[PDB]
Amino acid sequence: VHQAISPRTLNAWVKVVEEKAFSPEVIPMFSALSEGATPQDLNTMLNTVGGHQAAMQMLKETINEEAAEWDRVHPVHAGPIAPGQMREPRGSDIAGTTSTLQEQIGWMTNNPPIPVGEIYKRWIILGLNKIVRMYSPTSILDIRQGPKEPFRDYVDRFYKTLRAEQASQEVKNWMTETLLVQNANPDCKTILKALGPAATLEEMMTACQGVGGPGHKARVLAEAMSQVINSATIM
Amino acid sequence: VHQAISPRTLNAWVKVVEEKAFSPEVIPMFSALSEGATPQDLNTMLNTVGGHQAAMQMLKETINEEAAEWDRVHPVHAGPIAPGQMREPRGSDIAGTTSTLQEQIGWMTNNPPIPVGEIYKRWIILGLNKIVRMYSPTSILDIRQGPKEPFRDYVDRFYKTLRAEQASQEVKNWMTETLLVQNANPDCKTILKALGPAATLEEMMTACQGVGGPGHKARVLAEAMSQVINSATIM
Amino acid sequence: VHQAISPRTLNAWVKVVEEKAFSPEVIPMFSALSEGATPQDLNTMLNTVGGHQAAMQMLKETINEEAAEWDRVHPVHAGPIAPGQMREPRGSDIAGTTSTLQEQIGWMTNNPPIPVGEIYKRWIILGLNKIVRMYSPTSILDIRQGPKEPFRDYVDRFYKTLRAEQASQEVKNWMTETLLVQNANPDCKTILKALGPAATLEEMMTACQGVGGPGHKARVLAEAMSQVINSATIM
Amino acid sequence: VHQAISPRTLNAWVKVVEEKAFSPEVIPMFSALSEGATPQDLNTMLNTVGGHQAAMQMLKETINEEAAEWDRVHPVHAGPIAPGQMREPRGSDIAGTTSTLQEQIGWMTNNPPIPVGEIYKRWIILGLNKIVRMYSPTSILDIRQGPKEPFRDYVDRFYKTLRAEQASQEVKNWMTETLLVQNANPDCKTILKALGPAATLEEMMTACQGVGGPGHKARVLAEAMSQVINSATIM
C-alpha cells in the first residue's frame, strides 16, 4: 500500500487536459501531479485522456521510439546468477507492456535504486513537448464553409464536430442558432438571410439546396450582368 | 481484490454529471455504472463531482435523514455473543462514516447476505430523484442585467459566473464579446452600442458609468419631454 | 405480528394530506386511520408527509412542549425493584425517541394498561388543531407581481414555487402559458401583451427588462404628460 | 542537519507571490523551489504569504478536505507491536498539525519510504490550481465610483484599498493625484474638474458633497430642462 494514485488527482489531470486543448503549460501541472508515481499508474494517466486522439498517435509513437533507443544502447547480457532481481528492465517493459506492478516495485525499492518511473516520466515529458509544438486545436469556431461546397455537407460537418464540443446543452443550442448561419459563404448567406431567422434547418436546406447548381448560377450571373449593363444604356 | 471500481468508470460518471446539469435520466446511467459496488466506492463517486455544490446540500441532507430513519426502525440490542460479525450495521455506518472497507466486505460476503451496498444505492437514488425535482441549472445564457443595476456590478457578476462555465478558451472569449453587450438594459445598451463595437471593457465602463445617476436621469427625461412637446407646438 | 400498519393505509394518509393543504377535517380521517396504532408507527405516519415542511416546524414543536409538560408533572422516582417493566415511560420516550418498538409493546400489552399510543395520539391531534388555525396554504394562483419588482425576478419566483405544484405535466404547461402573463403589473403587462402571445420567455424578458428603469420611466411619464397637456391647447 | 530550507529561497517564493497576484504559472516555480522539502517547512512556506488572505480561505479548506478523504480511505488499525515507527501517518498529521519535525523525518528516512512530504505537495498543488481558477486579482486600477454613491465614501474606499497597494511612496502619491479624480462619475466629475486641479481633498470634498442630494438634483434637472426647452421657443 502507500503507493496508489488517488482518484481526485487523476480527475484533476483529466480536467486540465480538457480545459486546455494542448497549451505549453501542461508540463508543469503534469510533472507536479505525477510525482514519484509508478509507471503503471502513468499508463493509467495516459490512456484516460478522452478525445483528442489525434495527438495520441504522435505521443505513443515517440514513446516507442525512445524505448527502441534505450534498447539500442543497453545490452541484454546477464547471468547465470540464480533468480533474484531477475535482470535489468528493458525499453519494452519500462513502459509497462510486459511487466507487472510487482516487478516495477521490485525494481524501484530494490538496490541499486533504478528510477524506472522517473525515466518513463522523462520520455513522456519529451513527448508532450514535441506535441505542444506539432498540434493545432480545432474548435467549433473554426468550422467554415468552403467557397464551393454544398451547403448540406456544410451543416453535416458542422454538427459532426459540434457533438464533440465540450460544453453544456443550452450553450450548444444557442451556438447552433448563431454561428451556423453567421459563417456561411456570401452566396448562400444572401439567401439564407433573406429568409427570416425564424425558419428551421429544413427550410434553410431547401432554400440553399440550389447553390452551386446551373440554374442558380445562370440566374446570379444574368442578374449581375444586367445590373451594371442597364445602368447607363437603353435600347 | 476483484472488488475495486476502475478509473475509467469514475471518469465516465463525472463526464455524465458535467455534460448534463441535472437532467432526470441521470439515474439510469448511475445505477448502471455503480453496479454491485461497495459503499466506500460509492462515497468516492459522490464527493468527486465537481462544482454544482448547491445540490450536494440537499443530497447529503436526505442521506443523513434516511440514515436517521433506519436508526429509528432498527434496534441496537445485541450480545453477549463473543466477537464475530460484531453486530448489525447502523445507519451511521452504512454510509461508511464510522466503518472501514474491511467491515463492509465482512458484511457483504458473510451470511446472512446483508446488501448494505444496495441499500446505500437505494437511498442515493431517492436523493437524486428529489434533486432532479428541486433544481434549476444556471447558465451563462441566463445572466441578465437587472433593470436598476450599476453596469459595473453587472459585468462583475457576468465574469464571476463565467469562470465556472465549462468550455474551452476561445469559446469563452467570443461569448464575452457577443452576449455581454447583447444582454444589457435598453438604457445602457443605447449608449454602449452608440460607441462602436471596437472599444474594450474600460471604455465601455467609463461610458455607462453614469447610468442610474442624477445627471444622466435629468438628461434622458428632459430629452423625452421635449421630444414629444416640440412635435406639434411652437412658442 | 398482528400489530403492523398496512402500506395502503399509509398511502391513503399521504393522499389525504396532499389532496387537502391543511383543511380542519384532517383530524377525523387521521384518528380513523391511525386507530389503536403504536407510537413508532405514528412517527412513521408523521415524517412521511412530503412537502409542506413549514407546518412541521410548529407540529414538532408543540409535540416536544407537551412532552416537557408531562415531564414536569410526572416524577422519575422508581426502584429499587429488580428489572421488570423497567420504570414508567417518559415524555422523552413516549414519542419514541429513546425507546424501541419492544418497549412500546411491553408497555401497551403489560398491566397496568398504559395507553402510551393513545397519549401520543392525543398530543398530535392537539398539534394538528393548532396548525389548522395557524396556517395558510400557498398556491400557484397566488403568486403575483409586486408593484415595483424586476420582471425577471417575478418569473424566477413563479417557476420556483411552480415546481412544487402537485399536478401533472400538461397542466403545468398550460398554466405557465396563461397565468404567468395574466398576473403581471399593468406597466409590464401593457408591453408584454402588445407583443403578441406567440413569443417565448426569452423575447418577453428582453421586452420588459426595461421596466422600473430610468429610460422607461422618463418615457412613460412624458407620454402621460403630453397625453392630457395637448388635449385642449396649442402653441 | 542538511534538511533545512534556506532563507533566500523563502524570500524568492514570497517575491513570486507578491509580484504575480495569482497567475497559473505559480505552480512551476512552487514545485521547483519546494523540492524534496519536509511538510513542516511547507507550512512555513504557506502561512508566510502576506496579504491576499482571501484565497487562503479556499486553500486551507481544500487542504483539510483532502485530509478528510485520506482518512476515509485509510484505516487506523495497528498493533499491538511494541513502539517503533509508531503507526501510519494520518490525514490530520500529514499536514503537520499534531506531529513534530521529528516524526516527519522518522517517517521520510525510515523504510518503507513513505513520501509524506510529496503527498502534502500534491495536495497543495491541487489547491493552488483550484485557486487559479477561482480568483480575480483586485487592483488600484479597478476602484471606480458607483453611479449613486456619496463621493466621500468613494474616496474612503479608494484609500482603504490603496494602502494595501504594493508600491513605493511617490508612486502612490502621483497615483492619488491622477486616478482618483480621473475615475469619478460624470456628475461629480463635471464639478470636481471645473474647480481647477490645484485644490486639495478638503476643497474637493466640500465641492461634491452636494451630489445625489435634492438641491443639486433639482438644479441639474432644471438646467437640462431649459437647456433644450428655450432652444427653439420664446414666451
Author numbering:
A (entry chain L), B (entry chain G), C (entry chain F), D (entry chain H): 143 to 377
The authors write:
Gag is the structural precursor protein in HIV-1. It is a polyprotein synthesized from the unspliced viral mRNA, and is cleaved by the viral protease (PR) during the maturation stage of the replicative cycle into 6 proteins and peptides: matrix (MA), capsid (CA), spacer peptide 1 (SP1), nucleocapsid (NC), spacer peptide 2 (SP2) and p61. The CA and SP1 region multimerizes forming the immature viral lattice, comprised of interconnected hexamers. SP1, together with the last eight residues of CA, have been hypothesized to form a six-helix bundle responsible for the higher-order multimerization of Gag necessary for HIV particle assembly. A single amino acid mutation (T8I) in SP1 stabilizes the six-helix bundle, allowing to discern the entire CA-SP1 helix connecting to the NC domain.
We used two different Gag assemblies for structure analysis by cryoET: GagΔMAT8I protein assemblies expressed in E. coli and GagT8I VLPs produced in HEK293T cells. Upon iterative refinement, the final density maps of the Gag hexamer from GagΔMAT8I assemblies in the absence and presence of IP6 and GagT8I VLPs were obtained at 4.2 Å, 4.2 Å and 4.5 Å resolution, respectively. Overall, the refined models of GagΔMAT8I and GagT8I VLPs are very similar, with an RMSD of 0.36 Å. The GagT8I VLP subtomogram average shows a density that extends beyond the N-terminus of CA, where 5 residues in the junction region between MA and CA are resolved and modelled (bottom). Intriguingly, we observed a strong density above the six-helix bundle. This density is coordinated by two lysine rings formed by residues K158 and K227 (K290 and K359 in Gag amino acid numbering) near the bottom of the CACTD and above the bundle. A close inspection revealed that the profile and position of the internal density are different in the GagΔMAT8I and GagT8I VLPs maps (red arrows). IP6 is known to associate with the HIV-1 immature lattice and is present at cytoplasmic concentrations estimated at 20–50 nM in mammalian cells. When the same GagΔMAT8I assembly is incubated with a buffer containing 10 μM IP6, this internal density is present at lower position resembling that seen in GagT8I VLPs. The refined atomic model shows that the T8I mutation in SP1 stabilizes the Gag hexamer by enhancing the hydrophobicity in one face of the amphipathic CA-SP1 helix.
